[PDB]
Amino acid sequence: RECISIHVGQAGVQIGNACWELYCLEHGIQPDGQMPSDSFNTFFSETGAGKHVPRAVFVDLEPTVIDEVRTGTYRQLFHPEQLITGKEDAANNYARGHYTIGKEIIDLVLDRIRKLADQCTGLQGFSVFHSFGGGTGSGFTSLLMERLSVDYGKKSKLEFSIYPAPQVSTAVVEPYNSILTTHTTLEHSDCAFMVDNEAIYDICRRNLDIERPTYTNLNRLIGQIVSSITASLRFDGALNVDLTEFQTNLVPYPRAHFPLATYAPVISAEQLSVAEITNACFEPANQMVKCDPRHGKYMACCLLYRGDVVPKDVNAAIATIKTKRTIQFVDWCPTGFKVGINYEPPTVVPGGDLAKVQRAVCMLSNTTAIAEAWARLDHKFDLMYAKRAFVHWYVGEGMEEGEFSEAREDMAALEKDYEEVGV
Amino acid sequence: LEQRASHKVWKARLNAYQELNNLFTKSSVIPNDVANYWLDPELFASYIVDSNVVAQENAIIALHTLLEYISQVPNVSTSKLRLQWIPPLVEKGLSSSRAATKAKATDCIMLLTQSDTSI
Amino acid sequence: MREIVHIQAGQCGNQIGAKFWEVISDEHGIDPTGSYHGDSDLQLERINVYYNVPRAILVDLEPGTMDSVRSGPFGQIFRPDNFVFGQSGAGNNWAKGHYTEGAELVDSVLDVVRKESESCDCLQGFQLTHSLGGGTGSGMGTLLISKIREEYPDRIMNTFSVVPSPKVSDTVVEPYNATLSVHQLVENTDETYCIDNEALYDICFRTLKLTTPTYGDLNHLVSATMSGVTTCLRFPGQLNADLRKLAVNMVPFPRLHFFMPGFAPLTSRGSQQYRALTVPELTQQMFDAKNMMAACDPRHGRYLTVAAVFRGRMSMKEVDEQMLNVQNKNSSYFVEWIPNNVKTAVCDIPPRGLKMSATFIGNSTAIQELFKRISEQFTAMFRRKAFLHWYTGEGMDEMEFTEAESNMNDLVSEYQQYQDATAD
Numbered sequence: 013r014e015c016i017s018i019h020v021g022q023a024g025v026q027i028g029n030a031c032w033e034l035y036c037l038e039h040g041i042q043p044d045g046q047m048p049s050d051s052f053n054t055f056f057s058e059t060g061a062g063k064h065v066p067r068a069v070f071v072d073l074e075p076t077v078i079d080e081v082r083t084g085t086y087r088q089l090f091h092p093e094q095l096i097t098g099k100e101d102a103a104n105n106y107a108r109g110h111y112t113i114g115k116e117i118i119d120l121v122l123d124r125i126r127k128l129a130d131q132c133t134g135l136q137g138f139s140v141f142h143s144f145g146g147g148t149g150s151g152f153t154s155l156l157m158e159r160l161s162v163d164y165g166k167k168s169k170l171e172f173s174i175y176p177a178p179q180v181s182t183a184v185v186e187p188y189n190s191i192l193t194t195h196t197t198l199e200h201s202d203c204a205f206m207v208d209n210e211a212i213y214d215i216c217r218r219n220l221d222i223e224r225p226t227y228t229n230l231n232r233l234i235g236q237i238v239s240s241i242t243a244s245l246r247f248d249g250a251l252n253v254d255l256t257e258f259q260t261n262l263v264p265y266p267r268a269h270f271p272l273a274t275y276a277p278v279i280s281a282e283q284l285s286v287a288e289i290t291n292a293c294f295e296p297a298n299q300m301v302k303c304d305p306r307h308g309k310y311m312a313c314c315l316l317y318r319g320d321v322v323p324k325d326v327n328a329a330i331a332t333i334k335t336k337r338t339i340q341f342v343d344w345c346p347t348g349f350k351v352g353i354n355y356e357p358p359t360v361v362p363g364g365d366l367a368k369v370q371r372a373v374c375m376l377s378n379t380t381a382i383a384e385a386w387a388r389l390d391h392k393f394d395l396m397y398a399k400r401a402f403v404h405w406y407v408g409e410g411m412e413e414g415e416f417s418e419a420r421e422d423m424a425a426l427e428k429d430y431e432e433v434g435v
Numbered sequence: 436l437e438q439r440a441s442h443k444v445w446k447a448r449l450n451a452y453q454e455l456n457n458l459f460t461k462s463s464v465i466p467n468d469v470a471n472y473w474l475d476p477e478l479f480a481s482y483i484v485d486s487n488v489v490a491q492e493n494a495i496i497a498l499h500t501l502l503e504y505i506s507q508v509p510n511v512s513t514s515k516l517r518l519q520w521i522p523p524l525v526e527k528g529l530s531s532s533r534a535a536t537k538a539k540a541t542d543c544i545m546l547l548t549q550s551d552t553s554i
Numbered sequence: 555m556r557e558i559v560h561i562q563a564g565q566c567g568n569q570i571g572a573k574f575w576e577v578i579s580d581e582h583g584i585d586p587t588g589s590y591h592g593d594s595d596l597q598l599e600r601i602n603v604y605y606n607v608p609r610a611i612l613v614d615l616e617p618g619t620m621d622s623v624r625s626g627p628f629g630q631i632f633r634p635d636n637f638v639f640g641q642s643g644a645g646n647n648w649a650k651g652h653y654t655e656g657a658e659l660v661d662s663v664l665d666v667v668r669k670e671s672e673s674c675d676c677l678q679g680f681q682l683t684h685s686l687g688g689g690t691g692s693g694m695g696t697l698l699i700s701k702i703r704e705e706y707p708d709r710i711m712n713t714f715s716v717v718p719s720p721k722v723s724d725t726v727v728e729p730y731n732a733t734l735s736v737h738q739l740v741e742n743t744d745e746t747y748c749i750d751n752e753a754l755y756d757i758c759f760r761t762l763k764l765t766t767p768t769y770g771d772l773n774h775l776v777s778a779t780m781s782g783v784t785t786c787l788r789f790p791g792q793l794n795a796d797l798r799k800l801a802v803n804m805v806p807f808p809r810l811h812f813f814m815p816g817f818a819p820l821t822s823r824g825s826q827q828y829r830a831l832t833v834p835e836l837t838q839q840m841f842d843a844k845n846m847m848a849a850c851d852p853r854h855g856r857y858l859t860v861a862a863v864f865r866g867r868m869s870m871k872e873v874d875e876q877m878l879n880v881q882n883k884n885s886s887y888f889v890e891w892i893p894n895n896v897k898t899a900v901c902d903i904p905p906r907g908l909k910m911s912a913t914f915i916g917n918s919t920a921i922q923e924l925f926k927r928i929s930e931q932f933t934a935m936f937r938r939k940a941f942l943h944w945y946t947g948e949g950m951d952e953m954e955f956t957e958a959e960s961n962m963n964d965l966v967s968e969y970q971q972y973q974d975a976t977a978d
């Protein structure tokens with residue numbers, strides 16, 4: 013019944029905090045772990061003393077970020093053995109995350125995962141949170157995913173990748189790191205939700221009304237949308253009740269397993285209808301990955317409503333969009349939109365710039381227009397690899413230069429795989 | 436004197452290594468008792484780690500020509516030599532950043548390898 | 555990636571070195587006795603980087619320099635053991651610093667380096683200040699670097715090397731010494747800030763209108779630059795946080811790691827700055843070649859990578875806008891094949907005596923101009939074979955000069971290649 017979450021690099025770790033902050037508010041769980049109040053034990057385990065502990069591992073090749081976890085609001089929530097830190101970071105280098113530094117700590121990390129999996133009876137699989145451009149996030153994750161495909165091979169693994177964006181980008185080589193992990197993590201991931209930090213930036217500047225967003229701003233918005241996807245697993249809905257169903261509903265091709273997530277509504281803290289929010293799911297401005305689905309074919313599409321929702325309003329709003337817009341599907345797909353509803357209201361953080369809304373929706377749709385995002389990375393990659401720029405850093409940390417090309421071909425092949433489906 | 440091969444100033448050690456390198460070209464095949472850089476191989480093991488990159492390289496090329504002047508009979512005492520010598524040669528000769536300091540250290544090991552019965 | 559070990563070698567090394575410790579001790583709120591009298595946590599957040607008391611080693615063959623440091627203002631703070639000094643001086647002979655006299659002392663220095671590294675939670679790397687036209691700072695410094703490089707290969711090597719210019723010393727052997735030293739730095743250091751005395755004089759003379767600049771006047775510009783480039787390292791911040799990440803986003807090709815630093819606004823020694831600059835004004839001290847600490851024209855080449863550090867309270871929105879502006883309004887000057895090669899970071903704590911400031915670290919191919927000047931002076935000297943008996947007498951071979959000459963010219967050619975490169 014149980015799902016294990018893993019957080020790799022600052023991105024994973026800090027988005028993790030935002031998600032487990034938000035999970036504990038949605039489940040009425042206290043910062044100390046207590047609860048004055050099952051479906052939610054998919055994510056949490058239980059102590060003999062009435063304390064509810066997350067089924068989570070935090071990993072970073074450097075203390076600073078995870079140190080703030082275990083001296084913060086939720087320091088008591090996690091067991092200290094779950095929070096793992098090295099000393100030398102990967103320094104924005106996939107090679108160090110995967111080869112040089114990652115091998116020094118991979119075994120300790122896999123060991124601490126076994127301790128959480130041993131507590132579980134019918135383990136489903138893994139949720140994995142990590143950046144693309146980060147050295148740890150790219151290199152170590154891809155390594156950990158390889159090794160989880162051995163030590164737990166017969167079960168699911170889901171990604172929550174943070175797609176890079178120059179507005180918050182810390183490194184020049186982030187295209188490299190993105191391509192390198194996506195190549196080596198392609199075969200080992202069953203489904204993967206990309207999060208373009210540019211879209212999250214754009215959304216927070218427009219709909220949250222912030223001049224220069226911070227990471228807290230972006231992570232909170234992101235955690236809201238992650239909660240919307242994992243709500244089906246935490247409250248026992250009708251749709252997407254276990255990790256296999258994500259692949260069944262959204263993945264009709266092992267490789268092409270990258271859904272576009274769209275979330276409405278994002279209301280500043282300074283109500284809409286069911287129809288209004290469902291139209292916003294087909295507005296590009298509210299997507300998590302910047303692309304144009306109008307330029308692409310849908311392989312599948314799920315709608316996860318939560319809150320004050322009448323099942324008939326949904327069917328009206330669906331028929332509205334199925335008639336009054338031209339959402340092109342592939343011919344070999346069930347042309348019907350899958351739906352599920354969870355009547356509990358979207359929780360926000362007390363203090364949050366995001367307002368409590370009466371109802372909300374998160375549309376998960378495996379459109380071929382998301383290939384546009386791969387094209388933007390591949391292009392940036394090509395410019396730098398044309399001059400072998402920054403390549404010596406990678407090659408000097410245990411990586412063969414060939415691996416660059418093998419990865420790029422796998423990304424070129426993936427761009428062809430998206431094309432042939434959509435023609 | 437020869438004992439200046441362990442003298443404090445570097446340029447006086449640099450002489451003794453060149454003086455030696457002549458000795459092993461210019462002295463006797465049969466070999467003067469003065470050619471006692473076999474029965475105390477700690478001497479050249481010291482010289483190879485000279486603490487001066489220029490006088491080091493000159494000690495290695497003195498060891499090199501010594502270590503081919505010794506392809507005359509009877510020198511079955513090449514076992515002791517490989518033990519004493521190639522660890523200094525590997526550790527700090529192969530290690531070296533200097534083009535010639537390295538090249539002659541490898542050549543030296545070659546000559547110690549073929550002193551042996553095998554590798 | 556926490557602690558940094560600092561080294562200063564030679565006269566210049568300990569001069570701009572001590573000046574650097576003066577500047578960042580104040581900024582972090584440390585007094586000469588070594589006690590915190592600040593009033594902010596953003597000051598002691600990353601004090602562990604440079605301090606324990608400085609993590610600084612002082613080196614010179616010239617024993618007099620010892621006292622010139624301790625008799626200075628913050629001279630009391632440095633650990634007595636970390637002073638390592640020879641009996642005689644090198645006398646502008648690179649060979650004496652690298653092969654003979656400087657080599658005799660270098661072991662004693664490595665013993666102290668080891669001692670300071672031994673008690674580090676997690677070392678980042680090293681930081682050496684020195685001049686290149688000297689005998690000690692160049693010859694023994696480069697020998698120290700290699701000796702550390704091989705004893706600590708898992709660490710960064712970061713130098714603040716100052717280039718000789720006839721405008722500051724008429725010694726003609728400096729081209730030899732600096733050429734030999736550049737032949738080392740291109741192979742032995744991950745990143746090197748090129749401080750050009752030619753440019754320091756031209757700034758004190760022409761921009762600051764001082765008819766006779768002293769060392770102190772040139773050293774003021776340097777110490778302020780150093781605190782600027784080390785702002786990311788010393789205060790909390792997302793971007794260019796540690797030495798390795800910086801070099802990762804600054805150095806695309808291992809040999810081309812010579813940064814052209816420059817910062818703004820340019821102030822005199824303790825002058826009054828009534829009018830504080832605006833954000834667009836600061837931003838327009840980047841291409842402004844009168845703010846470069848290296849005597850090069852960024853207009854004459856192309857930027858491979860750029861790091862901007864804005865210090866003070868100001869609009870992060872406006873800085874982003876101005877930087878995004880100045881990049882695309884000069885798009886032909888930034889290399890196209892490295893996307894998002896310019897990176898900007900802000901620190902709220904301004905430098906001493908200024909309300910706002912901005913430092914501009916750039917890997918610009920124009921730096922080839924600097925290496926051109928050094929090589930032409932070297933070749934003019936070397937073709938007439940002047941003063942060679944100094945170097946050869948100390949165990950050097952005439953061949954070495956040819957190799958260093960050729961190797962610097964390869965370095966110039968490489969910069970010229972990537973300048974003329976195209977994305978197409």
Ligand SMILES: Nc1nc2c(ncn2[C@@H]2O[C@H](COP(=O)(O)OP(=O)(O)OP(=O)(O)O)[C@@H](O)[C@H]2O)c(=O)[nH]1
Pocket residue numbers: 020021022023024026027073101102103104105142143144145146147148149150174176177180181182183186209227230231234
């Ligand atoms: N949305 C979001 N993005 C983040 C967050 N933290 C980092 N990022 C992004 O992730 C990318 C890589 O940064 P990190 O994840 O911190 O790198 P890392 O995984 O710690 O790897 P190393 O630091 O190199 O060892 C950058 O482009 C950031 O913009 C976060 O909390 N939220």
Ligand SMILES: Nc1nc2c(ncn2[C@@H]2O[C@H](COP(=O)(O)OP(=O)(O)O)[C@@H](O)[C@H]2O)c(=O)[nH]1
Pocket residue numbers: 563564565566567569570616644645646684685686687688689690691692716717718719722723728751754769770772773776
């Ligand atoms: N900027 C600056 N340059 C200096 C200073 N002292 C010496 N130099 C320069 O360094 C070179 C002389 O080397 P120096 O460091 O004095 O010799 P060393 O003691 O053997 O390292 C010349 O190019 C000088 O112009 C100083 O205090 N500041």
Ligand SMILES: [Mg+2]
Pocket residue numbers: 021022074101146148
């Ligand atoms: Mg990190």
Ligand SMILES: [Mg+2]
Pocket residue numbers: 564565616619643690
């Ligand atoms: Mg001096």
